[PDB]
Amino acid sequence: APNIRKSHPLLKMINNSLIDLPAPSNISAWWNFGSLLAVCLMTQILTGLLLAMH
Amino acid sequence: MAPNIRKSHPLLKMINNSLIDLPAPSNISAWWNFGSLLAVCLMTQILTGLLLAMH
Amino acid sequence: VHNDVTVPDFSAYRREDVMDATTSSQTSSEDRKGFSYLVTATACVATAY
Amino acid sequence: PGAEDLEITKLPNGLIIASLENFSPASRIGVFIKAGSRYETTANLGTAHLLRLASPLTTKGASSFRITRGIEAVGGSLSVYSTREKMTYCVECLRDHVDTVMEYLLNVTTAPEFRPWEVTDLQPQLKVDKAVAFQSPQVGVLENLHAAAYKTALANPLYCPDYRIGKITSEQLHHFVQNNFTSARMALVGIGVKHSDLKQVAEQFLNIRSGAGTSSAKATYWGGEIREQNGHSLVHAAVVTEGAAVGSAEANAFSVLQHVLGAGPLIKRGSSVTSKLYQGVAKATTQPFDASAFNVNYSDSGLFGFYTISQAAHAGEVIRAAMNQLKAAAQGGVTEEDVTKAKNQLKATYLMSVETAQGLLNEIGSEALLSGTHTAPSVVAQKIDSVTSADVVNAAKKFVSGKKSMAASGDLGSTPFLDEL
Amino acid sequence: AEQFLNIRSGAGTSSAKATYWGGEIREQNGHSLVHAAVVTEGAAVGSAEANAFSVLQHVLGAGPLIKRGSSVTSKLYQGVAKATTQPFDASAFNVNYSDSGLFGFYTISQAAHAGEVIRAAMNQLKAAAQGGVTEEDVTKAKNQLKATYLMSVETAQGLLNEIGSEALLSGTHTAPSVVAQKIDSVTSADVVNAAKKFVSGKKSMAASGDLGSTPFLDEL
Amino acid sequence: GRLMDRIRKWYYNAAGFNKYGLMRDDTLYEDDDVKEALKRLPEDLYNERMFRIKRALDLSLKHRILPKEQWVKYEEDKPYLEPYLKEVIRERLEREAWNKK
Amino acid sequence: XXXXXXXXXXXXXXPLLCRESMSGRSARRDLVAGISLNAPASVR
Amino acid sequence: XXXXXXXXXXXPLLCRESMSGRSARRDLVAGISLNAPASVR
Amino acid sequence: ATYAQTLQNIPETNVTTLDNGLRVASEESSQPTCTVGVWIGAGSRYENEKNNGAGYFVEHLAFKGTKKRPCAAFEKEVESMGAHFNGYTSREQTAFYIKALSKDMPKVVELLADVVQNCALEESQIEKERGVILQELKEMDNDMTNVTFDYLHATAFQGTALARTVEGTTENIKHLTRADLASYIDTHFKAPRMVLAAAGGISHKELVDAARQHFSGVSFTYKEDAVPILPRCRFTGSEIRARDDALPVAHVALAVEGPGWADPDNVVLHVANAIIGRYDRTFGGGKHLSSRLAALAVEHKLCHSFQTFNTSYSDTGLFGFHFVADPLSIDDMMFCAQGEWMRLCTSTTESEVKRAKNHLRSAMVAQLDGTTPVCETIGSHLLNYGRRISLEEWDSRISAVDARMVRDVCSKYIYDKCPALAAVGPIEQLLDYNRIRSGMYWI
Ligand code: HEM
Ligand code: HEM
C-alpha cells in the first residue's frame, strides 16, 4: 500500500468515510442535513459541557 | 453471499472478529487476562458511577 | 508413508470408564457428559443468583 | 413369470424403437443419437461438448429447476454419454416412475431452449469438465491420436478446445440439435418397459424433423505424429494404422488379433501369459509397464495398434518390442490354438459386458441405431469364431504395411520417432 | 580479457548434431489470419550453398522495400497475388545454423484464402526450380542482397554483431569487399539448384490459425 | 378497456421520467428480482440502459432536463426489461411452491 | 445413483505408478465421455 | 536506454501493408534487457 | 408389470451347508456368464501387532500360483477360459472371486478351492511382492481420500484392531515371513468362516456338488469349528490433523460411532444419509439439486466434493461425512455440513424422506446390476446377516421409515456426541475440536 492514507488503520476509516467515499453525483441539499445533525450533536455536547461546569 | 449471518451482519461481524473467531496465540498466560479485566472494570466503574451521580 | 502413522497412547489423560480399549465407550457417555454439564449448569445457577 | 423377447419397430419417421421387458425392478430408458464432434466443423468446434453439459438447462416444457428436482424426487438419474460420433441420453429409475422421468428425458432431447444467459453461465463448466477428464494421461494422447490419424470428422476433439470456451453461441447449440437430432438418426431404447408403451410414447411426442439432416465429411486419413513433452516420469504412447469400420467383415478379424496380442490383464496383479504383446515386451525391458492392443471401430473408419505405458528411459525398449510383436504376428507367428484361445477370450468378454444394465441397453441401442435390428447372441458368437487363422495374420499384415500415426505424451527424451520403427 | 576474465577453459559440453525430422505441427486457434511456414533443410553457416540460398531468397523476394508498396522483384509476392484476391504477405524464409539450416516460404494470409496462397507460393518455387530464373534476376537479387548487407552494418548493433558473429565462429573478420566477391560469384545455375533442393527434399510445415482451409503437407 | 388506457397516458406524462429520457423500466427499483432480470439482458440493451441512467443522473445534478423534443413518448416507450422480469418471477414462484411440497 | 466423485484445480490442471495398481488402464476401446445430472462425470 | 514496451497476460492488422514486414526475414532472435523492453525478432 | 411385483418375483437365494461348516449360496438366472467366489470373514481386524497386512500380503500371492499348478500354469489356465480372477481384502472381509461362462462353473469352483487351500507361497515370489506392496503403499499415499479414511479409523478406533490399515506397516511388509503368511491362511481361511457364493446361469445343486468335492475334509476338534468372537473396539471422541500447506486441496472426514450390521437402525441411517447425499463439481444439477448441503455447496462454492457414509462393521460402524475443499472454504463447508446434521435430528420433513427413500430404493437395486455385484451382496449378506435379504425385504424396512423416525435415530447417534475428526492438507481455516464439538448440538 503506497500512501499512508489507505494504510493507516485510523486514517483509513477517516478516508473511507470523509475523503474517498463514493457518493452519488446527484444527491441534493436534502442530503445535507445528515452532516448537519452530526455537527449539531458535537455542538450541543460542547455547549452542554460548558453549561454543566456551572 | 456469505453462508451464516455471523460473518455477514456488520454489527455481529466485529462482535465475531473480536470475541469469537479472533485468532489468539495458544500459549498466552494469565498475564494476558488483565486486558479484559480493565475492560470489564471500566464498564463496572461507569455503571457504579452513574448510580452514584444520580444522587 | 501414512500407514506408518498411529495415534499415541492417551491412557495418561483418559477418564476412568474409557481407559479400557476393549470396552464400549458409549455406555459411559451420558455419565461423562452428564457430570461436566452438571458443573456448567450449577455455575449458571450460581451466576443467575 | 417367464422372459419374453425383445421387440423393434421402425416408425414412419425412420425412428427406431427397441424395447425389452426383463421384469427388473429398475427401468432404464435411453435416446441413442448419431451426433457428436464428428459433425463439427472449424466454425463450431466444441458445440457437441457443451451440448451434453446443457442437459439440465431449461426446456420448452420443463424448467432447469423442475428437471433436476423432478427427477431426484423419484430417486431417478439423468446422464449423457457420448463418443466422437454417438450420443446417448439415459435415464434410470424405479419401474413406477418411468413416465415421470420419461417426460424430462423427452423434453431435454427434443425441446431445448438454450437460453443465452443459461448457456453463458454454463460455458465455464467446459474448463472444469475438461480439466478433470484430462487428469488421466490417456485422454491426452487419445485425443491427440485422432488428431494425428485423421484430417476431419474423427480428427475433431471429443472435449472442447480451450480457445473456444465461452465462445460457443446459443444459436450454435440450436443449429446442432436441429441438424443432427432428427428422427431417422435416433432410437428410443428401453429396458424394463413394455414395447407397446415405449412405442406409444415415441409416437405421441417426437416431432423434430424427419430425414437425415446434416451429414459428415467422411474421415480422410492423415498419418501424423503428435508429441507432447511434459516431463512426466511415465511416457504414454500409441501407434495405430487404419483399422476397420463397424459392420465390416474385416472388423471381427482385428478384434481377435487384439486378444491374440492381448488386451489388458484378466488376473488382478497378474502377468499376462496369453498376451504375446505383454510378454514380448517383458523380455525387452526390466521395469514395470503396460502394453495393450488398441482397436477402435467407427462408422466409416477405424484404428488399430498398441498402447504402451512405460518408464521414461525405457520407452524406447517397450515401443520397439511392442512393434516387433506385430511384425512377428504378421510373419505367421500365430498358432491355430492362439486364435481359438483368443476367439474364446473374446466371446467371453462380450457376454459378461452385457450383464450390466448399462452394457445391455448400450449393446441393444448401438445396433438398433445403425442397423435397425438386434442380432441374436448366438449368431454374434457364430460371426466371431468364423474367423480364420489367416484372417488374423492378414490383419497383422495390414498394420506393418499401412501408414502409421503416433501419439505420445510424457518425458519423450528417449521416445522413438515414427520413422524409427 | 586476460587480466580479469578467465574461469573454465576448453570446449566443454558439446551438442548432438541436428537430426532432421520433417514433421507437421498445426495449431487451431480460430484467428482470422493463418500463418504458415514450409521449409526443407537449407545450408549451414559458412557453407558452399550458403550464398546460393540467400540469392534465391531475394529472387523469390523477402519483404517489401517500399512502404505500403507491392513487390515487383518478388516473384513470390507477385505469383501469389495472381492467385488470391485479399491482402496477405508471403516472403522467403532462410536460416543458417552451425550444422544445419532451413529454407522455404512464410505466408500470412486470410483464413479461407490460406489454401490459395500456400499452393501458389509453392508453385513459385517449383517454377523457379524448373529454370524460371533470368540471368538478370540473379544480378538484381545479388544487388538487393549486397545492399541489405551493407546498410545492416550501419547501426552499432549491426556492426558489433557482424564482427562478433564471425570472430566467434571463424576467428577472423572478412573485408566487406571480399564478402561482396563471395556473393556475386554465385551463378544463375546455383540459384536454380537451390530451388531444386526445396522441391526434392523432405518438407516440414508449421501453421497456426483457423486452419479450416489450410492444406496439409502431403497436398503440395 | 380504453378508459383505463387513457388514464395510463396521463400518468406517464404526470410522472415525468420521460423528461429525463428514461424508459419506464429504467425507473424500476432494483430488488432481488429486477437485479436478476437485468443480468439476463442482452449487451446492447444493457449498455444502452446504462447510458440513459447515467444521463438522467447527470441531468439531476444539473437540475436540468432534456429538451421537449428528446422526451420519450408514451407510445414509444420500450418495456425492454418487463418480459425478462416476468419469467424471473415465474421461475421463483415455482421454486417457492415446489419447496412447500 | 452410483460412481465416485472427483475434483482438481484449474488454470493449469489437476495414482498411476506401479505395474499392477497402474494396470487395467491402457486403452481398450477409444474414449467415451460421460456427464450426469446427479452422478460424477466419467471417461473411458 | 531506448525502445518501446508492451503489456499482456495469460493464465488487428488486416491490410496487406500495415501488417507487412513480418514473415521472418531470418528466423527468431530473443532479446531481454536490464533497462529496455524485451526484444523479439 | 410394475415395481411392487418385480421384487417378489425375484428368484430366492438358495443356501446349504457342508459338514465342515462352509456355506454355499446361489442366485440362479438365465445368464450365459456368471460370477462365483469365496467371501471369507477375515481382514486387518483379525490381524495384530506383528502380522498386520499379512492378509494383504496373502492377497498378492493368491493369484501367483498354487501347489497343484504353479504361477505359469495357473495364469495360463485361467486366461484361456476367458475367465477373470479378482479379489480384495478389507478390515473385516476378504474375498476371491471369478467371472466366467456358466459352463465352467465346476472348474471354477475347483480353481477357487485350490487358491484358498493349496496356495504355493513360493519363497522367491514373496520377495518380489515385498517391493510390489511397498510401491502400492507409496502410490496409495498420494490418494488423499485414502490417507484421510485410514487416519479416521486410526483415531476413531484408536488403540484397537480397527485402527490399523488393511495394507499394514512398512516394517511388517519388510519383515513378514513365509511362516507368518502361511499362519494367517491356516488360522483364518477356514470353512465355517467362508461362503461360496455364485450368481448367473448356475444350478444350485450342481454348485454344492462341485463344492462338496473340492471344499474338503472335516475339522477334528471343536476349536476348528467355532467362529471367533472378536474383542470389542473402543470409539474415541478425538481428532488427528496431518497438516501440509503445500498440498493443493484439504480433506476432512468427521464421523460418529455406528450401530453395526445387525442393528435395524442402519436402515434409517442410510435413509438419513440419502437426504444429505453427495456432490462433486461435475454434478450437472447444480444449484437446483434437492440436497440442501449440495445446494449450499454450489451457491457458496464450499467444496470440490462431499460424501456421506455409513460404514458398518460387525459390532460397530462409522456414521459421518467427508469433503474436499480449498484452504479458505473449509470452515464454511464444515459449518454447513454440521448444520445439516442438526437439521436431520431436528427439522427432517416427510417430504424429504419421501425422496430419500426413493433414492435408497433405486440405490439398492442398482447395487445388484450384474452377476458380480449380486455375488458380492450374497457373499456379504451371509457373512454379516447370516442370511440373504431380498430386495423385497429391504423395501419393506425402508418403506416403513418416516420423518419422525429419522429424527429419533439421528438424535441418538449424532446429537451431542463427541465425533472423530480426520483432517489432511492445508487445514488452517478449520480449527479447534471444541468448536467442532459445539457444532454437534442445537440447529
Ligand atoms: C443532543 C444533545 C443535547 C440536547 C438535545 C440538549 C437539550 C437541552 C435542552 C432543551 C435544555 C433546556 C434549556 C432551556 O430550554 O432553558 C438543556 C439544558 C441543559 N443541558 Fe443539554 N442538551 C444536549 C446535550 C447536553 C450535554 C452533552 C450536556 C452536558 C454534558 C448538557 C447539559 C445541559 C445543562 C447543564 C443544561 C441546563 C442549562 C439550561 O437549562 O439552559 N446538555 N439541554
Ligand atoms: C474509569 C472510570 C472511573 C474512575 C477511575 C472513577 C474514580 C473515582 C474515585 C477515586 C472517586 C472517589 C470516591 C472516594 O474515594 O470516596 C469517585 C467518586 C465519584 N465518581 Fe467516579 N470514577 C469513574 C467513573 C465514574 C463515572 C462514569 C461517573 C458518573 C457518570 C462517576 C461518578 C462519581 C461520583 C458521583 C462520585 C462521588 C461519590 C464518591 O465520592 O464516592 N464516576 N470516582
HEC string of E77-143 equals HHHHHCCCCCCCEEEEEEEECCCCEEEEEEEEEECCCHHHHHHHHHHHHHHHHCCCCCHHHHHHHHH
For A26-29, the CB contacts below 8 A with 24+ separation are A26/F57, A26/F58, A26/F60, A26/F61
Q: How far is the CA of B43 from the centre of ligand 2 (A)?
A: 12
Burial (CB < 10 A; 0-12, 13-18, 19+), residue E61, is: buried
- Tell me the nearest-neighbour CA distance from G5 into chain I, angstroms: 6
How far are the Cα atoms of D224, D394, D421, G8, G18 from residue D238, in angstroms, in the given order? 12, 21, 13, 26, 19
Quick one: DSSP state of residue B30? G
**CATH for E20-220, among 3.40.50.2000, 3.40.50.2300, 3.90.1150.10, 3.30.830.10?**
3.30.830.10
Please identify, by atom number, the ligand 1 atom nearest to the C-alpha of residue A40.
1
Strand G33-36 relative to strand D77-82, pairing: antiparallel
Q: How far apart are CA D116 and CA F42, in angstroms?
A: 9
**Residue partners of D237: CB distance under 8 A and separation at least 6:** D141, D307, D308, D309, D310, D315, D319, D406, D407, D408, D410, D415
Distance from the first to the final alpha carbon of chain A: 49
The C-alpha R_g of chain F, in whole angstroms, comes to 16
Most E CBs within 10 Å, among H2, H15, H23, H27, to test the E interface: H23
Residue type, E147: A
Elucidated via: X-ray
Cell numbers describing residue I249: 486441496
Instruction: Look at residues D252, D262, D231 and name the one whose alpha carbon lies nearest to residue D302.
Output: D252
Q: Does H2 touch chain E (CB under 8 A)?
A: no
- Tell me the nearest-neighbour CA distance from C40 into chain I, angstroms: 14
What is the CATH classification number for the domain harbouring G5? 2.10.210.10
Identical fold for domains D1-209 and D221-421, yes or no, is yes
How far are the Cα atoms of E21, E70, E109, H26 from residue E37, in angstroms, in the given order? 15, 21, 11, 13
Contacts with I33 from chain D: Cβ below 8 Å: 348, 351-352, 355
Which residue has 424396512 as its cell numbers? I397
Burial (CB < 10 A; 0-12, 13-18, 19+), residue B10, is: exposed
Quick one: DSSP state of residue D77? E
Q: Do C5 and I238 touch (CB under 8 A)?
A: no
Which of G6, G35, G39 has the CB atom closest to I305's CB atom?
A: G6
Q: How far apart are CA I191 and CA C35, in angstroms?
A: 49
Q: How far apart are CA D17 and CA D9, in angstroms?
A: 5
Cell numbers describing residue E83: 492467385
Q: How far apart are CA D399 and CA D323, in angstroms?
A: 10
- Tell me the nearest-neighbour CA distance from G4 into chain D, angstroms: 13
**Is domain I238-441 in CATH 3.30.830.10, yes or no?**
yes
Contacts with B5 from chain I: Cβ below 8 Å: none
Q: Do residues D49 and D218 touch, judged by C-beta distance below 8 A?
A: no
What SS3 state is found at D296? strand
Which residue has 476433439 as its cell numbers? D157
**C-alpha I87: how far from its chain's center?**
13
How far are the Cα atoms of C34, C39, H9, I442 from residue C45, in angstroms, in the given order? 16, 10, 65, 21
Cell numbers describing residue D158: 471429443
Q: How far is the CA of B49 from the centre of ligand 2 (A)?
A: 5
**C-alpha E174: how far from its chain's center?**
23
**Residue partners of D409: CB distance under 8 A and separation at least 6:** D137, D140, D141, D144, D227, D228, D230, D232, D235, D236
Query: Residue E123: how many CB atoms within 10 A of its CB?
Result: 15
The C-alpha R_g of chain E, in whole angstroms, comes to 19
Q: Does D359 touch chain G (CB under 8 A)?
A: no
Q: How far apart are CA I271 and CA I268, in angstroms?
A: 5
Q: In what order do the strands lie in the sheet with D7-10?
A: D7-10, D16-19, D186-189, D26-33, D87-94, D77-82, G33-36, G42-43
Which residue has 490417507 as its cell numbers? I147
Which residue has 499379512 as its cell numbers? I54
Q: Do residues D311 and D233 touch, judged by C-beta distance below 8 A?
A: yes
- Ramachandran quadrant class, E20 (left: phi over 0; alpha: psi -120 to 50; beta: rest): beta
Residue type, I188: H
Ligand number, closest to the Cα atom of B38: 2
Q: Does C16 touch chain I (CB under 8 A)?
A: no
Q: How many structural domains does chain H have?
A: 1
Which residue has 514380448 as its cell numbers? D280
Exposure letters I14-24 (e unless 16+ CB within 10 A, then b): bbbebebbbbb
Which stretches of D76-221 are DSSP H helices? Answer: 98-110, 116-122, 125-133, 137-149, 170-180, 195-203
Cell numbers describing residue C13: 489423560
Size of interface D-I (CB pairs under 8 A): 149
Annotated catalytic residue: which of I27, I47, I59, I167? I59
A48 Cβ inside 6 Å of ligand 1: yes
Residue type, F83: P
Q: Do residues D100 and D75 touch, judged by C-beta distance below 8 A?
A: no
Q: Do residues E78 and E89 touch, judged by C-beta distance below 8 A?
A: no
Please identify, by atom number, the ligand 2 atom nearest to the C-alpha of residue B55.
35
For the four alpha carbons of F70, F74, F79 and F85, in that order, the dihedral sign comes to positive
List the beta strands (DSSP E) in I158-273: 194-200, 239-243, 250-258
Q: How far apart are CA D307 and CA D286, in angstroms?
A: 18
Please identify, by atom number, the ligand 2 atom nearest to the C-alpha of residue B53.
35
- Tell me the nearest-neighbour CA distance from A25 into chain F, angstroms: 6
| Fold type of domain D1-209 | Cytochrome Bc1 Complex; Chain A, domain 1 (3.30.830)
B1 Cβ inside 6 Å of ligand 2: no
Instruction: Look at residues I395, I237, I408, I228 and name the one whose alpha carbon lies nearest to residue I314.
Output: I228
Please tell me which residue of chain E has the smallest CA distance to D224.
Answer: E24
Which residue has 459378461 as its cell numbers? D352
The phi and psi torsions of I238 (rounded to 5 degrees) equal: -155, 175
Q: How far apart are CA I279 and CA G38, in angstroms?
A: 8
Q: How far apart are CA E19 and CA E21, in angstroms?
A: 7
Q: How far apart are CA A26 and CA A12, in angstroms?
A: 25
Cα-based angle I247, I250, I255 (whole degrees, multiple of 5): 145
Ligand number, closest to the Cα atom of B53: 2
I59 is catalytic: yes
Judge H/A contact: 3 or more CB pairs < 8 A: no
The C-alpha R_g of chain G, in whole angstroms, comes to 13
Please tell me which residue of chain I has the smallest CA distance to D26.
Answer: I365
Q: How far apart are CA D192 and CA I9, in angstroms?
A: 14
Quick one: DSSP state of residue D160? P
DSSP string, H4-38: -----------STTTT-S-S-SS---B--BTTBPP
The class level of CATH for I13-226 reads alpha beta
Domain ranges of chain I: 13-226, 238-441
How far are the Cα atoms of D102, D200, D203, D368 from residue D17, in angstroms, in the given order? 14, 10, 10, 8
Q: Do residues D268 and D237 touch, judged by C-beta distance below 8 A?
A: no
Count of residues for chain B?
55
DSSP string, I353-388: HHHHHHHHHHHHHHTTSSSHHHHHHHHHHHHHHSS-
- List beta partners, residue E208: E27, E35
Please identify, by atom number, the ligand 1 atom nearest to the C-alpha of residue A54.
35
Q: How far apart are CA D319 and CA D311, in angstroms?
A: 11
Q: Do residues I311 and G38 touch, judged by C-beta distance below 8 A?
A: no
**Three-class DSSP labels, I26-46:** EEECCCCEEEEEEEECCCCCC
Contacts with B2 from chain I: Cβ below 8 Å: 300, 332
Ligand 2: residue whose CA is nearest its atom 33: B49
The class level of CATH for C1-49 reads mainly alpha
Q: How far apart are CA E172 and CA E174, in angstroms?
A: 6
Helix axes I178-188, I54-61, angle to 10 degrees: 90
Give the range of the structural domain holding residue H35, as residue numbers without chain letter. 1-41
**Three-class DSSP labels, I45-79:** CCCCCCCCCHHHHHHHHCCCCECCCCHHHHHHHHH
Domains and CATH numbers, chain F: 1-101 (1.10.1090.10)
Q: Do residues E87 and H15 touch, judged by C-beta distance below 8 A?
A: yes
Q: Does H4 touch chain E (CB under 8 A)?
A: no
Q: Do residues I167 and I91 touch, judged by C-beta distance below 8 A?
A: no
Strand D16-19 relative to strand D7-10, pairing: antiparallel
Resolution to 1 decimal, in Å?
Answer: 3.2
Cell numbers describing residue D196: 407397446
Q: How far is the CA of B42 from the centre of ligand 2 (A)?
A: 11
Q: Does E20 touch chain D (CB under 8 A)?
A: no
Instruction: Look at residues G20, I99, I166 and name the one whose alpha carbon lies nearest to residue D268.
Output: G20
Which residue has 470489564 as its cell numbers? B40
DSSP string, D177-191: HHHH--GGGEEEE-S
**C-alpha D63: how far from its chain's center?**
31
Domain ranges of chain D: 1-209, 221-421
Contacts with I307 from chain G: Cβ below 8 Å: 5
**C-alpha I130: how far from its chain's center?**
25
- List beta partners, residue D17: D9
What SS3 state is found at D233? coil
- Ramachandran quadrant class, D23 (left: phi over 0; alpha: psi -120 to 50; beta: rest): left
Q: How far apart are CA D220 and CA D148, in angstroms?
A: 11
The phi and psi torsions of D82 (rounded to 5 degrees) equal: -155, 140
Cα-based angle I64, I65, I69 (whole degrees, multiple of 5): 165
Q: How far apart are CA E99 and CA D119, in angstroms?
A: 54
Q: In what order do the strands lie in the sheet with D405-410?
A: D225-229, D405-410, D234-242, D302-311, D290-297
Cell numbers describing residue I441: 448440538
Q: Does F64 touch chain A (CB under 8 A)?
A: no
Cell numbers describing residue D129: 469438465
Distance from the first to the final alpha carbon of chain F: 39
- List beta partners, residue D112: D59
For the four alpha carbons of I392, I397, I401 and I407, in that order, the dihedral sign comes to negative
Q: Do I296 and B3 touch (CB under 8 A)?
A: yes
Ligand 2: residue whose CA is nearest its atom 42: B49
Judge B/I contact: 3 or more CB pairs < 8 A: yes
Q: How far apart are CA D275 and CA D167, in angstroms?
A: 46
B44 Cβ inside 6 Å of ligand 2: no
Which stretches of I62-157 are DSSP H helices? Answer: 71-80, 105-117, 123-140, 144-156
Specify the DSSP element, H or E, that contains B14: helix B12-19
CA dihedral in degrees (A10, A15, A21, A26; nearest 10)? 130
What SS3 state is found at D299? coil
Cell numbers describing residue H18: 500495415
**CATH for D221-421, among 3.40.50.300, 3.30.830.10, 3.40.50.720, 3.40.50.620?**
3.30.830.10
Ligand 2: residue whose CA is nearest its atom 19: B49
Query: Residue I115: how many CB atoms within 10 A of its CB?
Result: 23
For the four alpha carbons of I433, I439, I440 and I441, in that order, the dihedral sign comes to positive
Contacts with B4 from chain I: Cβ below 8 Å: 332, 335
How far are the Cα atoms of D401, G25, H27 from residue E24, in angstroms, in the given order? 22, 29, 18
